[PDB]
Amino acid sequence: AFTFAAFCYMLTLVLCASLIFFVIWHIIAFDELRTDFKNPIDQGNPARARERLKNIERICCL
């Protein structure tokens, strides 16, 4: 029957979706980082270098 442990399990079940969301966000951000890294890292254009650096910083902050 309903008890303290069952309620704990329900609440953890609801809160584990958040962890799944967080890890999915992690892997998406790291896939973007890989797309930036494995792709040529030439920074000849100052604007391109600044944009890439700010993207990296933004993802790290996130």
Partner: protein, 51 residues
């Protein structure tokens, strides 16, 4: 019965337990939680956390 003769019992009985009558217990510290079971209180705490 080996030396005298009895009648059929006029009163049957047996061993039993005597206790002091339960009294109005002196109220305990934290008797204000008694209306709800401890499990309800803990579920309340963790529902607060979860919300």
């Amino acid at each position: 019965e080996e030396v005298i003769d009895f009648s059929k019992p006029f009163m049957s009985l047996g061993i039993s337990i005597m206790i002091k009558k339960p009294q109005k217990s002196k109220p305990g510290v934290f008797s204000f939680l008694d209306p709800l079971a401890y499990e309800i209180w803990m579920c309340i705490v963790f529902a607060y956390i979860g919300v």
